[PDB]
Amino acid sequence: MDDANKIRREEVLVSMCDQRARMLQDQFSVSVNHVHALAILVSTFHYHKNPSAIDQETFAEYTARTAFERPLLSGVAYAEKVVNFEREMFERQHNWVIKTMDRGEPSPVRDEYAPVIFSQDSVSYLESLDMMSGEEDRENILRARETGKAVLTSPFRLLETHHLGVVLTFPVYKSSLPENPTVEERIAATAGYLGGAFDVESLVENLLGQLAGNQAIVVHVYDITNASDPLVMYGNQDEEADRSLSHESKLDFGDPFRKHKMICRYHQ
Amino acid sequence: DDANKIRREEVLVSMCDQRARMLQDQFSVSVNHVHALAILVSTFHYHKNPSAIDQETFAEYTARTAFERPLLSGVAYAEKVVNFEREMFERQHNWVIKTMDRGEPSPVRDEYAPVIFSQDSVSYLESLDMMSGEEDRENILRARETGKAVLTSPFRLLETHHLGVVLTFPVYKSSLPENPTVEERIAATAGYLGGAFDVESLVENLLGQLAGNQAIVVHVYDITNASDPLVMYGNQDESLSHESKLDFGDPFRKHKMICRYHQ
Ligand SMILES: c1ccc(CNc2ncnc3[nH]cnc23)cc1
Ligand SMILES: c1ccc(CNc2ncnc3[nH]cnc23)cc1
What we know:
The structure is a homodimer.
Chain A: H1 5-48, H2 56-65, E1 73-80, E2 82-83, H3 87-94, E3 112-113, E4 116-119, H4 135-147, E5 151-152, E6 156-157, E7 164-173, H5 183-188, E8 190-198, H6 200-209, E9 217-223, E10 231-234, E11 247-251, E12 260-266
Antiparallel strand pairs in A: 1-4, 1-8, 2-3, 5-7, 6-7, 7-8, 9-10, 9-12, 11-12
The complex binds N-benzyl-9H-purin-6-amine (2 copies).
PDB class: hormone receptor
Keywords: sensor histidine kinase, PAS domain, hormone receptor, endoplasmic reticulum
Assembly: dimeric
């Protein structure tokens, strides 16, 4: 309970929190970069190559063998853009119907869809699901294709596991995409979307739980995109912790549309 | 003297340590992306039949992903070819296996590692037997016997003559047994995925743009043989220094960064 010992108590909190934030940010960055590579893989080996080198078996094998490259992701998949005019054709060729994510039921008529055609086996239940039939995923698809860049959702409970996480989506464009394209041109040139699920609830707990001093510290991560409406991304905020001291560590997950932060406290 | 001396030491440690972290991190990112390319060649060239990868495709994919491999000047894939197979191999590729030093047709050897796929930045490697250079040859043998990424000593690279280090990963056939012996690894070897760390240019680019670069002297040494340190980066010069840790991921090799003030 001494002074000066409590200067050091805070010094250790600051160092522990800052290190955890740097680890989370670095590992997410590594994962985004490898998802970018997979988007380029689909472009080069599925679209550009005549004939395609990628079937479901191939995508499953390659993604399984490279899972270690994407540490915070529970799975990756590729969804192809399908406009309604094309839907009957697409379904006949694939020998399956486009399904809704809420029920796995045949999709109602929509202007367009994003059905998963390739999946890592860890997320095999995504196959044939229209990723535009979930609101988080729909919004991410639109912003991915309009901006040309990787985008993140708000935190929400993922399919099957119901774990609290965030989704990462990258656009894949046709070779007809003009140089210095307008948004309207990006949309017209969209082939599909390469997505991954950051299972924060399971995988961030696994990362943090293996670190020395974990039992001493409470770690929470927030999506603070809207200042007046912070959203829990990781942690049990209700859980009892030391109310007298906290530290805020910076996080940058790389999507300028979203903002995040980590807050650490001692248990008692 | 003297509180100012303390601050001067603290600045040196901080400057050197950050540079060391930046270099280790960039190396690590490149090593990891090279490992992914090794897996890509295995999946697309060997596991799929017929092969679903070729030079055009490898060149496009590696060009588009060059950003994933900082400090690498280029990547190439060399296939293992034993002498009995040479005639068939050369007929299939419509070219002759060449020596690295003169580009002359290779004399007969027990085996060869001719480059079949290359990033266009290292297009001059195509058809060269990578076993015809002693640093690359040793790297290839150790990659295939250990099953893991390996690094060379610093040496001067082809074409540019830049001082650098080569990274080599083995690629195996799916006939590789589980928990293989070294003999089983050799037997199951398909080829070698390599890249060149151009230290002289690309590490200079990384470190030389940094603030305070003019106030310090930075060296990186390969200290695999403690009695014969080899310069990887810096000048040939033999009080106040600081040693910062580097780990480039190959247990066969050891490295360190040393930083010093000028005056
Ligand atoms: C395209 C393909 C895949 C994805 C990734 N989303 C996703 N992945 C896994 N689990 C889910 N539950 C809700 N959304 C997801 C996004 C776009
Ligand atoms: C297989 C394929 C490519 C490599 C990489 N070597 C290499 N790459 C580039 N330049 C060099 N000059 C001397 N050696 C090399 C190693 C194994």
